Ligand binder design. Structure first.
Ligand SMILES: [N+]
Ligand SMILES: [N+]
Ligand SMILES: [N+]
Ligand SMILES: [N+]
Ligand SMILES: [N+]
Ligand SMILES: [N+]
Lengths: 104, 104, 104, 104, 104, 104
């Protein structure tokens, strides 16, 4: 199981900015997003632990540069258990398959 | 990939005002809107980077002029990655196709 | 494209009061309402710009008279672009067609 | 068109208490409820204007007596326009038909 | 119509604790739960008025003992009208039928 | 009926961190998660009471170590009643069946 990165911000523009910076800075795959409530949005990414780390730094940076956006919470999980991958929306799907193949 | 603009405000009237000003001021396509929670609404637009910039300025202006509405957060992403376009609701749809053709 | 009026209040009773006052005061058509989150509700109306203006004043007045209700935000857009009408829930539907014919 | 009464409170127990008091105190029909967001709940009722008035007073009273519940907002509309009845969830349905017949 | 008890707390763990205490302390049936918004959860129960009273006391107690949980609002309605039972999610379903038979 | 553990935090990254720590620290099964509103997320786990206790401690610890995340509320129920298991989303599903077999 490749690493998972998760970042949450207030407002959609901030999560859009994080999304674009993350996938450009590291060899990662964006696997989904969550409308968390209270105008907060979560972005979930997958890839090698070091690539997720690089992406996360660029994501935080993009959010800081985005007007009205703030990073509320983030985490990187190096080797997520299969039970976690199954229950939480962090698994790969066929939609993001071309981006998974390109990342690895 | 043409640029993406994203703007978020408190209240629907403000997002309606932004929508109408943006599409009239620049050669852009409104691709969707998000009900973000907490009475916040997101509008997403696509087009040439300079047209999105012109639209964004007019959108911010329309929101400022709208009673009880405030721009909470906004961003412009010049060349959004395909993985971002696929996962986030910023892609073109057939509904907005006549407006895409007119913009370009 | 006939004008669009949009009004948002805290609480459903206030939006009910606005709805009834607006359609009685001007020859307008109520096209929909939005559950905006945080107990806020949006009402969207269509009609001639002057009729929408008359309706909006009566709506604001009805909300002010309604216990526990306050107008949070409102706007009137005289000639909404087709792209806006398509993406945002402000278009006419067959349900409100008898009221459209009666208004014009 | 018979009158419409609308009451909103914080918390579900309060709306349950209002519901039961209203239908017992007046010859009214409960037509629906709304989960308004932020733990607020709306109850909508229909009937003769005087019966709705009697029910509303009993509803407010029940909410006041309910632990942790407060009436946030309420309204009575004597003769709701058909456009309002169609768009907003205040119309009769077959589910509440036996209670409509009993009320009148 | 047997009595209805309704309790609301902040957070799901608190409603889980209330659920388990209520059904163990009294001869009642849990009929459903509501995700009320703002991280608030409602639990609805049915049974004899005295059994609902006993359950409610145990539920409040369980919530008080639960870390980070507080009872926000609660009510007991002895003989809920049929119109209330039909419109609000407080009626018995086949899923909870074995627990209804065991309670009575 | 095996024990149930429930933990709630602000933000998705915190619930992801709790998920991975819990399943690795104890022989437990993650049965589901809840989008609770207000950017709060609930995680529900099942297993032997002592395993759930070990997992819960590791979960709390993971949340404390996660940037911007805080444990809002948690509970452990040793022997949940069948009525609770049926109504609330805490039961096993075929998706988590391989993890149930591995835990026991
Ligand atoms: N920012
Ligand atoms: N404004
Ligand atoms: N008011
Ligand atoms: N109360
Ligand atoms: N508590
Ligand atoms: N933390």
């Amino acid at each position: 199981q490749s690493a998972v990165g998760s970042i949450e911000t207030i407002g959609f523009p901030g999560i859009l900015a994080a999304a674009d910076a993350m996938v450009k800075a590291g060899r990662i795959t964006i696997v989904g997003y969550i409308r968390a409530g209270s105008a907060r949005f979560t972005l979930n990414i997958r890839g090698d632990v070091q690539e997720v780390k690089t992406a996360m730094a660029a994501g935080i940076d993009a959010i800081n540069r985005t007007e009205g956006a703030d990073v509320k919470t983030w985490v990187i999980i190096p080797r997520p258990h299969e039970n976690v991958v199954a229950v939480l929306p962090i698994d790969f799907s066929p939609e993001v398959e071309p981006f998974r193949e390109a990342a690895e």
